[PDB]
């Protein structure tokens, strides 16, 4: 993904994100991928605990899932998994101590949704990730530091639908097979707005 961020304003929410991703012509993944963040107003000076995220992920004959690692590597990092079923986008907060099926994250992080969309080729989500930037699971603790002006992030996409797709806590996954990477997601001032609190208040949907 690009390290230097693009800037994007979602029309309906009015939320402005820094974004990074891969185009549909990228050889690194099929169908493109985009991730973005909006942060608390002082995030570039003081480490935030939360963000509002944007995900745009690909579908392969209307199947597949995508994921972000908030720490970079698959392991020892809070993981966000996302996938569509019918007209709903689900997420699951996950954590892996090794290169195997990630477990449900045991910490207090919580995702709420602002909006989502599903069509035949893509799905997208805008979501608030509360208490997501510092994590603790099974004695492993870590976090990301917005005040450093960069987030080390990982992404994956996959072609198969998760098993039990209507139950985030019980999903099963195959090893992702539609690209992966770790990159430096550089942040600029567009990523932090006085409007953050108003924007976060739009995240009123809890998708169970």
- Is residue 148 at the binding interface for ligand MAN, with CB under 6 A as the rule? no
Stretch that binds ligand NAG, among 93-101, 116-124, 144-152, 170-178 (CB under 6 A): 116-124
Question: Could you give the CA distance from residue 54 to residue 195 in angstroms, rounded to a whole number?
Answer: 16
Neighbour tally for 24: CB within 10 Å: 12
Q: Give yes or no for a contact between 17 and 7, defined as CB atoms under 8 angstroms apart.
A: yes
Q: Specify the residue, 104 or 201, whose C-beta has the smaller distance to ligand HEM.
A: 104
Token look-up 């605990």 returns 49
Per-residue tokens: 157: 């996409």
Interface with ligand MAN (CB under 6 A), residue from 4, 7, 9, 14: 14
Q: Specify the residue, 164 or 188, whose C-beta has the smaller distance to Mg ion.
A: 188
Residue numbers 105-124 binding ligand MAN by CB under 6 A: 112
Q: How far is CA 135 from the centre of its chain?
A: 15
Interface with ligand HEM (CB under 6 A), residue from 176, 185, 187, 196: 176
CA-closest candidate to residue 103, choices 146, 69, 138: 138
Work out what residue 202 binds among ligand NAG, ligand MAN, Mg ion, none; the CB cut-off runs from 5 to 8 Å by kind: ligand MAN
Q: Specify the residue, 94 or 128, whose C-beta has the smaller distance to ligand HEM.
A: 94
Residue 208 is given by DSSP the state -
State the residues that interact with ligand NAG by CB under 6 A: 56, 117, 119, 121-122, 124
């Amino acid at each position: 993904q690009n390290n230097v961020p693009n800037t994007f304003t979602d029309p309906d929410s009015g939320i402005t994100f820094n974004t990074w991703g891969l185009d549909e012509d990228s050889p690194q993944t099929q169908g493109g991928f985009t991730f973005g963040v909006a942060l608390p107003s002082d995030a570039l000076t003081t480490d935030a605990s939360e963000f509002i995220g944007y995900l745009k992920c690909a579908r392969n004959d209307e199947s597949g899932w995508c994921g972000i690692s908030l720490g970079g590597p698959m392991t020892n990092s809070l993981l966000i998994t996302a996938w569509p079923h019918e007209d709903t986008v689900y997420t699951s907060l996950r954590f892996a101590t090794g290169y195997a099926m990630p477990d449900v994250y045991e910490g207090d992080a919580e995702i709420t949704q602002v909006s989502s969309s599903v069509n035949s080729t893509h799905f997208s989500l805008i979501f608030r990730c509360k208490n997501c930037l510092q994590w603790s699971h099974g004695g492993s603790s870590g976090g990301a530091s917005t005040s450093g002006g960069v987030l080390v992030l990982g992404w994956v996409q996959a072609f198969d639908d998760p098993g039990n797709p209507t139950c985030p806590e019980q999903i099963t996954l195959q090893q992702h097979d539609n690209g992966m990477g770790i990159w430096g997601a550089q942040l600029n001032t567009d990523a932090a707005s006085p409007s953050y609190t108003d924007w976060a208040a739009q995240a009123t949907k809890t998708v169970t």
